[PDB]
A = this chain, B = another copy of it.
């Protein structure tokens, strides 16, 4: 009754929500709806209004002052002007004198003009008036988000090992590249639980194969790593290689599981393996088929995966390549100078992730052919869905690590997200993206660091200490390796707390990271803070994101204990009063703040999730307070035991 759904035209069923909401017949309650040329929602904002949401998108926590377009795109350079990233997360909340949330359930290009054109005007528009709009009421933003979290269903939950630290890099290839890392960390006592294998582990980049030469006996080797508490996490891409005799390819062609051109032929998209076809992610049979293919790696002992290139990305199509060559030919032979270099250059750029290509193939949705652009933002979502639904059929009681590059709301039930250059500013960018992603159901997230300096790496890791996905995209290639061990030690000492908070949040449709505004709604200073986040109900983080900085300014909305994990293995604490502070944070120290009347458990440092001692964990924070610890086996889904909850008291 605090949520209403307004339907326009004949919307595509995106399955974003799991709760059914009845269609409202009354007037639309906020702003104005026009269906003249397409669809447009327009709303005049109050000057004090803050606009939260949009999950994975550019800029700040408050979205006012710019334009955002939901249109999943593989963009390598996330500069301030970019209007479209990997995710399409169509949920906003206006927070002010009048407060309300809106979900725009629409699968295509959706433009949020949020004060870009006129400062006071919010305008959300798309090309077709075929969509549901959910309006949600509440006393404040935080209340509105929790109701949204309920109706889109419970977020993906990873196995406990995924709260360890993982190492990654595009390059690894041989059993040796991998064994070095094993000794690299283990012999230097650096905690680690995971190692990601990038595309190079596949035979000629063929989904659901392993390179036979380099990996003659894969199961055995997977076990070799698992005996040292190291779990390999192989990638899987959207594109299936065109190649006679390759069974994934042959099956897809035979049974019509690929996306087709207008004429019925299988669309060709060039990606990592050269020519490929895209599995039709919106066709149920295709999905089950594609997902079933993970058994191949699972049966070999693999306990987790990552998806990439699932926008889906396109280096070029055959049509696009054919046009590019034809143009190159004219340029080649032009002497009048009628064809300029920059035009040649532009044509070459245009065939990548080309809008025209997205109009070249179709989805077969239960017999009905739908042009891909019309449902573009659903592709990566349904690829991750295919994996997740496969996992359930295969082993329903077991959690697999899984996360994806591209997404839409509704994918949050099946896997997490990772954010993809090595800039200081990307520390803060990734920080600000977290609360918004939590608002939209994506809790298991983290970022990579794309030209890297030691100090940039350490600051970046100090943020990752807190992000559920913590991975390096090495640690040993520098001076003073203890700094890097020291930072990861903090991560493993905080895992029981972090995992606990994540489970409690996930199981209750709550947020792991929160903006200060959600926790301290009456504090006008707090609501505007964007470079600090609240975690669970116990702490606040505030990472250093400036090069050569030895400290930073913070605002404390209440009395807190300033905590630092020191490099020597100790923990410094200082009580600090409500208000503004400058705090000192050395490169090898990990800071956080514990709120008045709270405490958190801290474990002794361990090198793998399995070996952390959560028996007599030290409690840090305020005497007299208590903490409810959540603990299970981290492997299965026996979430509801009363035994999972233990009350610790400092």
Contacts and interface: CB of A to CB of B under 8 A. Distances in A.
Interface of A: 59-60, 62, 64-66, 77, 79-81, 115-116, 118-120, 274, 315-316, 321, 324-326, 328-329, 331-334, 337, 341-342, 344-345, 348-349, 351-352, 421-425, 451, 453-456, 479, 525, 528, 530, 546-550, 553, 555, 580-582
Contacts of A119: 453-455, 479
A315 B333 CA distance: 19
A615 to B, nearest CB: 39
B349 A345 contact: yes
A455 B315 CA distance: 37
Contacts of A479: 118-120
A548 B582 contact: no
B332 A325 contact: yes
B325 A331 contact: yes
B64 A548 contact: yes
Contacts of A525: 582
Given A65-B547, A80-B424, A329-B332, 16 more contacts: A60-B548, A65-B455, A66-B547, A80-B423, A80-B425, A118-B479, A119-B454, A119-B455, A120-B479, A274-B337, A316-B341, A325-B334, A328-B344, A329-B329, A345-B345, A530-B548
Contact of A341 (B66, B315, B425, B530): B315
A422 B332 contact: no
Given A334-B325, A422-B81, A528-B549, A116 B581 contact: no
Contact of A580 (B66, B345, B582): B582
B528 A553 contact: no
Nearest to A346: B348
A54 B582 CA distance: 29
Contacts of A425: 80, 425
Contacts of A328: 328-329, 331-332, 344
Contacts of A77: 79
A292 B344 CA distance: 39
A451 B80 CA distance: 10
Contact of A421 (B62, B81, B118, B546): B81
Contact of A62 (B64, B451, B548): B548
Contacts of A118: 479
A425 B334 CA distance: 42
B81 A79 contact: no
**Which 4 residue pairs spanning A and B have beta carbons closest together?**
A329-B332, A553-B553, A328-B328, A345-B348
Contacts of A64: 548
A451 B334 CA distance: 35
Nearest to A118: B479
A121 to B, nearest CB: 10
8 contacts: A60-B548, A66-B547, A80-B425, A81-B422, A115-B453, A119-B454, A325-B333, A329-B333
Nearest to A119: B454
Nearest to A582: B580
Contacts of A321: 341
Nearest to A333: B329
Contacts of A348: 341, 344-345, 348
Contact of A332 (B62, B332, B581): B332
Contacts of A530: 546, 548
